Amino acid sequence: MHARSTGSYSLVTQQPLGGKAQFGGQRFGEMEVWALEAYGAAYTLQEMLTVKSDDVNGRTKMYKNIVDGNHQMEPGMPESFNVLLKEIRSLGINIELED
Amino acid sequence: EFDAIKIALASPDMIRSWSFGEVKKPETINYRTFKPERDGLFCARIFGPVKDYECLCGKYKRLKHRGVICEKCGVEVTQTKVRRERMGHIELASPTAHIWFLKSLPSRIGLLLDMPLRDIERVLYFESYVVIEGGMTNLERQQILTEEQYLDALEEFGDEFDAKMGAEAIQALLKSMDLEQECEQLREELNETNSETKRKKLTKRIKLLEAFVQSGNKPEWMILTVLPVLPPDLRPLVPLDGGRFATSDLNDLYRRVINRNNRLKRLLDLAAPDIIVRNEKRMLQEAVDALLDNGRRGRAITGSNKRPLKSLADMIKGKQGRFRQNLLGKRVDYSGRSVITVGPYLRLHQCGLPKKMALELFKPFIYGKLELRGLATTIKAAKKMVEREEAVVWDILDEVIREHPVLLNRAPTLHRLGIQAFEPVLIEGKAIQLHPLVCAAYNADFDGDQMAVHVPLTLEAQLEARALMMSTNNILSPANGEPIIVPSQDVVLGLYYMTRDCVNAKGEGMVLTGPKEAERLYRSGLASLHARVKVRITEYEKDANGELVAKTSLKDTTVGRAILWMIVPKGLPYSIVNQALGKKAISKMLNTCYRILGLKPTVIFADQIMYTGFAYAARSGASVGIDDMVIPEKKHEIISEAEAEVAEIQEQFQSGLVTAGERYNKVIDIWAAANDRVSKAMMDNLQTETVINRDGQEEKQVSFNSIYMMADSGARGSAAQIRQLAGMRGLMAKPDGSIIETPITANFREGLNVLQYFISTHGARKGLADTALKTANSGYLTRRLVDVAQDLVVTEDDCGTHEGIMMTPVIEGGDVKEPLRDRVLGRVTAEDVLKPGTADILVPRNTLLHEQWCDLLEENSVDAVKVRSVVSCDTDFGVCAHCYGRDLARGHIINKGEAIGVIAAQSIGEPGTQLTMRSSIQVKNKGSIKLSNVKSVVNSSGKLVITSRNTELKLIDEFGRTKESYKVPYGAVLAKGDGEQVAGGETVANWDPHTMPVITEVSGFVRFTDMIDGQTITRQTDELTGLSSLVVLDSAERTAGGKDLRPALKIVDAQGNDVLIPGTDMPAQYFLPGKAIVQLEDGVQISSGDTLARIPQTGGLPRVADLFEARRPKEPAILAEISGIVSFGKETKGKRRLVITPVDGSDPYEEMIPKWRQLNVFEGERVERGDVISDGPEAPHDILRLRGVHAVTRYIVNEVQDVYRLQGVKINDKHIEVIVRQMLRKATIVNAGSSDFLEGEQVEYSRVKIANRELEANGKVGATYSRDLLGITKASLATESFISAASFQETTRVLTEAAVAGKRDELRGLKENVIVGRLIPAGTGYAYHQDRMRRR
Amino acid sequence: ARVTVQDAVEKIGNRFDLVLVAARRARQMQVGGKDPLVPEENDKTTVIALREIEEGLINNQILDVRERQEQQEQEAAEL
RNA sequence: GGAGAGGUA
Ligand SMILES: [Mg+2]
């Protein structure tokens, strides 16, 4: 029996740690993403993999909002995607976002 | 903000543009003062400050100085996030090649410059020179040379010719080429001379070339000159905390390449001998190759433990790659994990939850509520209060929980139902209670399975949960309308035991005035729980328009049933509660209840069902005792008899009168017979054992033996298990699939001896291993499946077409495997059906076939129906609603926006685990006989002999609806004609299954035309009997003398002239093939239909895997490529040759046929396309290209559903049809016309479909496409969006190609939207996404 | 208490836009200083909005009408 | 943080 509301954060990627030893959180796996897609549920998926895990400013302001009794969120962009972008650009590949 | 993603090459200039400095030193950290080095791999002046707004030398350490740089460090005082976004660069002393563009397979460099890859690798690894221009002399543009060749060439020709060796030479070559000029030259050359293989090669090379000019890429950029470097923070140097650090192999690769670079720099400064610099340059090239992608070279590199290091090319591939590890699946806050228990007292819409986990999860909400109540005017005091959980906090928790749903998930979530929302109820335990009915949906045993808990934070998430994922909303499996909340195993037992009846129980024959009296009587104990009694009740029939008419009656049932009736809702017939109520009965009852009284009554009824079932099951006290395993008395006698029988056979083999194999087979047969006898005997002795006096003398009834009650009720175990328990447990099969001659003659009530148990253990281990490997593979299969069909979303209402498919009830030679009523249930029609009052419009052409209309069809005995499929919907990037049909997850048409592809994929993939891995016609019914594809004659006996192959026999009933169907083998004798009347059990046809005759059509003399003994035939007259016999020899068997002649027999007559074919003017002559044994003589009468001569003759999960993958079969039964007469050509060139010739059309088509193929047709036959020329499996690609789309799709669905239903699993065809539609999504051009597409282009079917469609609005002629089919693993890769493919496997191959093409992704698929984390254009997000699309 | 959403879906036969309209109403209610139209029984805002949807006195069209009317009122409240 | 070993559903 174990739970985690908001704890530490992995270093290279800003996601909750894993395992009971650390105060980590569960892993919303790929198949579960598929399952959520099968329902019409879209908002919940977006929040779950954008603000509850990754986007730093998103979760900071989400914490503030929740404290302030105002359930709303600002998506932003996942950091790990920027990580992938930089990693690819380290190779000779020039990759970027348009307008 | 941003809309699209662009990818391409980078010039060295652009690399420098990105860079924020140059690295020069391989040193990183001092290990004594942990600040970084001056300009080492880690460095502040290049990357940035370590602490926020802190100068490294600390001359300035406050935010006031923001923007300035230090004069001692040149470091920019600013945040440390800059240390995660700054990239450095390395100036490489020598040019170097990019590994990916070298060993890409295909190698872009290789084919681009058009050199075999071996030569290129030789040149790049400093072992072979190559001329750059080599003009004004014997040499050519790009001749290669060895070392001695090079020195000789420069000696003899020390003129200006140049031959270099390495990346510099390659770069010179590439930069020294004009693309467009070569493009023109190559297109002119490929114009013709010659399209044999140069066709393909030139087309591909021209494709690459025109791609290059199409992008803003210059070829020489493949040769790295300046090397980017990752930001330090993305490759952090974690301390091991033992005073040392971890490995972080990336940094070691960096230091190694830096050392090589500096070493080469020094040597070049010193102008060392060329050999040394060449060796060092090779070393540097190898280091670069390792850094970019280690392992692709013949030897990877390892630091310790002989494990290769992690190259950049490894951070992306495989499961550990970012895509599949952190970018598609992530860890998440606000989560919990626990074991699960039943707690059956719960409502279906709520679940238990421990106090501790509940308190942990909702902490922020608790803080908010506390601050609102004012009990804590801060967050720290509030944290303290919750930390010591004052008594107040608990009521606050209860308040917060009031209406906040949560999500429950189980680990192996196969299908959509594997995760569901619930309301929470607090509990003073540490285990998540769970309403038992959903366990079936979760396939969750209580043997220690764990579950995970999530909470939806935002309001929209809560509403989504409540309105979509609440348990009470998911009651029908999406795979099929069947309910999914079946009372599983215990409640069913209770109910079955309740609705039984002893012949003579306490309180029998009396009369009751309603169920309440029944309950009271039973509770007082004055009557048994099941005894026959007449009681008055009131049914509620709502036949009127939503008006529940009550009607009373005085029925005769058993008290238990009456008591149970109290629960059922109003509008149901009492008959539904009048049987023994097996599991199937309960499931059907629930289904009907939902179909009639909507949703809420059904769920409440289910809850009451469960409560009552548990109560009365517990009351029953149905236990199991050893005495229940009743062994049949006659078993010993039966076994002894069988053994004695075996003895005589063993004797017969001892004397040698019989062989060994037959002994074995007969032994097995008699053993099976005896085992069956034993099983039947025990079953009979068990099920009816109960004999009870009825207040008369004596009677019998079904038995109450606990085991039989559990088995028949269906709670647990089929007859097989009870058979093993009581009777002998049959035969066991040894590892190689063989079956042991001696069966296991002992049951489990008795003890098995050693050997028996040994054999059983072997079998069980086989089973377990098979299960493990099966699930392992099934996971991969389903992962593939969902990947290919994730982009499809219904997006329209109606596409406005009329094409469809003729759904018909399935026949397998035997009975109706599935009636039509269930194949078309819930799918809109294409064209209105006309009743068999023909010209009688029975239904509209665009109505949904819900249950009532299906009943109309059934009472009208319809045969086949034109139904609108999905494979032909005219919607682009989606499918109109009507083409799909009903939801199948709720009783009404599909909504607009649903992601049908994903649910179809899940439905197909989930059941995979349950699968396995490794003469005459006897009609049996009185009716009309009908025959199709009949090309037959009457023989000498007056019967009917067929000469067509696909002839089919139907038995139709008096009404006129087909009832039975059977394939007619070729050349079979038939008693009847067509349209006669048959009797049940009347044999109607017969044939020989062994040999092939030379059956004729008409009576007359037979003449041995073009048959000379010695070189065409041999006089191999039969010696056993003495009748005339001469054998036409094969090509190889015949000598070279009679090769040119073609032996044949032409039907002749007394006059000697050739007889004519019936009807046609062509003369009749059967061309006798090789090895044609003829026992007839010359000029001898033979009648119609007579053999002139004689010539002799998996289903597991991998079957599905291959079939969907569209892999070609082992022995592809060739087909009739086109229509027209058949002929032969040049023979035995390793194979035979055949040429087809239309009646009028040209005839260039020939084929080369392996000698092993027994072609049934002869040259003298005109054959239509599609007809089998060989026997064996069939390749889907040809099926498509020769019979359009509706043929291949029907074949596929028939095959797959056959496999599935063979194991007893129900799946709707839509889920497969969508898959097929995705599979065939491409096209290939045959003629551009007024279009702008190159001929051999393979283009997305949709693009051409709209381009031609709009061009015809103009006075322009479109193109002439030709659809194509691909295995899923290929089609998923040949998709416009490259990111979607990249997240899929073999990232490198797709990514390199896309970068060369400079592709540009626009992000309108699902998976990519998930990657970038924005609302999916599928569900609720579909509305917003479409709205935003419209906004631009 | 709320156990089903069948009646709300009957009022709005799409089952997706239902979520969005209910969310907008509940957002007006929670952060926006608005009041319910049905007597609450110590229940959260989401269920209250859903019940409002159920009774049919609030749907997407009426919501559009109300937001436009209050926008006009605000544009008339500046002077 | 990464490897390897074992274990549960
Ligand atoms: Mg288990």
Ligand SMILES: [Zn+2]
């Ligand atoms: Zn300084």
Ligand SMILES: [Zn+2]
């Ligand atoms: Zn359509």
